[PDB]
Amino acid sequence: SLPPVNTDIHDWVKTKGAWDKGYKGQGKVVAVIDTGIDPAHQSMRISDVSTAKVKSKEDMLARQKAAGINYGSWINDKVVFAHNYVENSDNIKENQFKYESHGMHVTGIVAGNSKEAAATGERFLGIAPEAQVMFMRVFANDVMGSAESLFIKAIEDAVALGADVINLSLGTANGAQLSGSKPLMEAIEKAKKAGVSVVVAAGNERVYGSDHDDPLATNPDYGLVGSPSTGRTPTSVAAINSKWVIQRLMTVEELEKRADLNHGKAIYSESVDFKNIKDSLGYDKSHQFAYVKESTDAGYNAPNKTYDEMIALAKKHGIPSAFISHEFGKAMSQLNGNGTGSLEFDSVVSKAPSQKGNEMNHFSNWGLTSDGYLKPDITAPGGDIYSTYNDNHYGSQTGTSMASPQIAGASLLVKQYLEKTQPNLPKEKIADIVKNLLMSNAQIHVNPETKTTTSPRQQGAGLLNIDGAVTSGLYVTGKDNYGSISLGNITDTMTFDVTVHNLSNKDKTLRYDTELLTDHVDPQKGRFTLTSRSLKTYQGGEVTVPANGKVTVRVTMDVSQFTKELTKQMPNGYYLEGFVRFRDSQDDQLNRVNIPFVGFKGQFENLAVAEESIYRLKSQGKTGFYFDESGPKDDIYVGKHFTGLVTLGSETNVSTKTISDNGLHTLGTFKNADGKFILEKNAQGNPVLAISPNGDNNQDFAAFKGVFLRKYQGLKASVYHASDKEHKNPLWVSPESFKGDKNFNSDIRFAKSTTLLGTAFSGKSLTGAELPDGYYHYVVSYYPDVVGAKRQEMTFDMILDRQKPVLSQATFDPETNRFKPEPLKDRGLAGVRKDSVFYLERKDNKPYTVTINDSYKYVSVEDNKTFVERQADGSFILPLDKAKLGDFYYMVEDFAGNVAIAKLGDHLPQTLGKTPIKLKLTDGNYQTKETLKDNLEMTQSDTGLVTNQAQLAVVHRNQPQSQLTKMNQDFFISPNEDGNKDFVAFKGLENNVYNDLTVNVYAKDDHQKQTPIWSSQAGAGASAIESTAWYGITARGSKVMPGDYQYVVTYRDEHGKEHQKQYTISVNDKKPMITQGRFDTINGVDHFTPDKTKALGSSGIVREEVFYLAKKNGRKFDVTEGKDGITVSDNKVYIPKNPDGSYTISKRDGVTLSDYYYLVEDRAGNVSFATLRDLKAVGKDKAVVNFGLDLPVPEDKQIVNFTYLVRDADGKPIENLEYYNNSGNSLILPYGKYTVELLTYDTNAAKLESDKIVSFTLSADNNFQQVTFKMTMLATSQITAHFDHLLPEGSRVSLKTAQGQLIPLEQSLYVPKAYGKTVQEGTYEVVVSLPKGYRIEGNTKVNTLPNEVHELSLRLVK
Ligand SMILES: *S(=O)(=O)c1ccc(CCN)cc1
Ligand SMILES: [Ca+2]
């Protein structure tokens, strides 16, 4: 009666062992959170709805109204809840118009109780056939914000409705066990407090560098298990490939009686492109194929009658389409002994052995948590699974996502068991148990290629054995009462208590032993091989566990022997891990139960957080892990991946003013002849790290770039004077602190390095004063993410050199044209690095060339230097034939990037050719630190305030011209570096004097002007405006908050009594919002009428423009040549305003509506513009609504990610969105009543404080609505109490908040004197409860700062 079940999968998990026992799925409920279903499919069946946990609609909808749930409903007797959480209850489809549905394939594993054949002829079934499947659809996008709250209420829904276990497909690599996402952990811990198991896959990134190279032996912390599975409560799942693949597969009758290779049937693969099965699949062929090769002994890794000689894929034996196939050595590549090869190609499907069976699935996650805890927890198949696809179709897989549902089913079944067998067991202790049985009853997997046991860090506590878990009544724990043991740090001896637990009323007796493993290293490459070495099995004996009882035995081991060999191979520590194995002394193969352990010989706390500086590695002739030594010697292109400093380049020109800049480059590097950036060296053979904070945009600042090996936090940049050897008086600290992840590079979407421009240093002290030239330390410090760790530093030697090298004189011999300059002398500590002579080769009548990039709409201007060879004695044979002498320039170059350039115009009248001459050289200040066109004349009727002024380009991307302007009204700056109203400065009258001129910007709150938040540096005269220019920043150099500040000018030089100015400057940087206006047609031409602009406030409009751009040279922009240099500009043609209030948009000579622009500028200088074609896609009947977040922070350090749902006046989601002015946050809707709901945002960075539902009506009169969700920012800090001596037992450490509440603190595993927590920014008192007279002493208070780490040095007293 057609029952044929595939058990390729149930066989070696022992599924039937718990089925026949009456534990099928029935009665329990598994909540699958994933991307969709097709819940009518054959498989979502349950027989005997009368034994289920939920009867029908009446039952379900009634539980919904007792919990407080208004959405979603039952469908089947199997699919009992649904809710498409992407936009608050849609259908769960994921259809086409492959046909794969990842989300149901998942469920297919857990409960696919089908009754019909797949393409083999088998009836596939899930681990729990008869459990009921509430489904929450939830799946994250990048445009979104933080998907978390979606999940968090899917979890909360499952729990209140009453599920028993949730299969959560959600992964964030390198998770931590204790400091995960706080609202998500507690949401889970609430499921665990009910009868809920939370089963989460563990990831597919596998280990640090998995897409580059195996990890170096010096960096043992290569694990990537992800959050939330890294949670203590949930059960993380790794994956082992299945032994049996179901696949479309190629056949050959010529080897049909071989049975070595499935009787001819061999497995093929098709690469990144060009799956040519639409090219002759199902019909026999000849040798006329693309048989790749063997490729190895056992890899399986990826005439002539199609003679296309395909190396478009080969590319190294000793994507362009010919024919795609990958076959392994035996499979045919040896079976090549007639060459005739009749080759059918799968008109059907087949069942075959997996080329990687029983192997551990390359991608499965691994390693410790980020805070050093042992996860995953259990392995299950995943691998090449077969399961429930779109509609009546069947699986495929390879993915940890497929393993975790296995455990779901298992957790279901085991729970049944426990309910039956231990019904005095409360829902408080249910789920940890169903786990602890699942883990302790499992077969330690054993790596087939090595015949060693696979590391616990890769398999948890072994492969899933469900029978063993329901037929034993035995589980195992360590001290933490957890199914594994995370020992933390490890000395010469490892000692620890294991404890075996017995549920049955039949006491048992068991012999045990301990296998101890470590990490195999390839000794020729010094990299881990990701395979273990058995070191020694230690046996310990046997003991007896009472019936309904426990017993506590003590493993102990001495590992002194291995320490010299291991510690040699693995200098920075190494893992010592393994299994305690437990069998019945009588009848060996009964009561097989095991517990995995791991510990670290060294200090896992203090492993290096960042890969060493590229400069230091090259000084040791070592190299970076992701570095690419391809190119000239010492070629550190800033694009490459490493740890160093970056800075910004700007060439020096002698015919015009530079217009542009080279962009970023690695500090200490300089461009050689061929344009390769090279790490040039000083006379002692070192490179030099020197910046030149002069305002010329050549190496003005220095910023840290790192390749991090572990998750970091607390990272900041400080600058000390190098005399300050202990680093105890910082001269400057980066104003932000920084946290972030390993650069693990699982694939191209994961960065191999991260540049932190927030660490940029500019030779300014903490007070804005300039730090004098000298020798300094730029210390980048940080912390790994394990409580107690020591704070790692990384010091860079850095020179401030702001002085050009010397140009005194040179000796010229006219007989040979010999130019000997002198010995090279630099001013300052940078040192000279290059000597040069060039002349200006005129081309097209100009000494420079003007390149116009028409794709970036960018213009760059370049001196036409040509060089004069340097001879080894340091002199220059000038080609007098190719340009005059004295139109040769001599150029000497700093290391920090100052540049001296003399023209030979420091000359004597004719003299041409007599005899050797001594020749004076003077620097022409060709490198100048560009300043702003003044052209202003001040008069007593003026405020004396001046600011700067500039337009905003619409097409070209050069920096638009700007000039100083007066400011006698409208005291508002937008500090946005656009050249328009970016600062307040003070200019004085020409015939007046201003002695001891000092500007101080005081805060709002400072009634007495006691403590400036910004001050002018010493030497600030009313003529140097820059010295009084306030770019709306603090002394330390971060942006002030939008608002009002007092700007106070004080000069003494009224030749006696002095005065004080005091203007109220207001800071605001908000792009004004352009609404759509009307478009009417008068006479035969288009007439555009903008809506009326209001002028109240800082964002009130004071310029209104309609214009269009004429095509001049096929360009809409244009270069204009002056002595002032070249300037770049749009081809703006303005349109006068009619009295109508309209502007007249004439359709001129091939000028289009997309080249007319509306543009506005508010009282603070912010500027916005739209195109008239955009502003017209609004119908005349239609309105526009724009949603946005109101953050009280500068409009560059603000979220821009969130999502919303607009509902029509009936509550239906609006459909068929049309966006306005190219903003995904602006919709065009017909007139009516609407309601918007803030769905997701980065709940990490911000907290919503206004209503999350807003109503609005769009109407003829209100045809533009802004709705704004108001928010508040979130700052976290880390706090760590570090004690003198370990605390006496029964002590309790806590952080006491200023409201008065207590945050409890746990002792840190890897540092046992340290108790710490990540906390919300504020003020805390460390509070300790000591059981005796004990009295902890010394400075328990702290006021944290954002992203900082705070240590407290407390002492236990007697
Ligand atoms: S599953 O949804 O966790 C999964 C498995 C494998 C991949 C690609 C890695 N080769 C993605 C997702
Ligand atoms: Ca400079």
Ligand SMILES: [Ca+2]
């Ligand atoms: Ca110092």
Ligand SMILES: [Ca+2]
């Ligand atoms: Ca210098």
Ligand SMILES: [Ca+2]
């Ligand atoms: Ca501005």
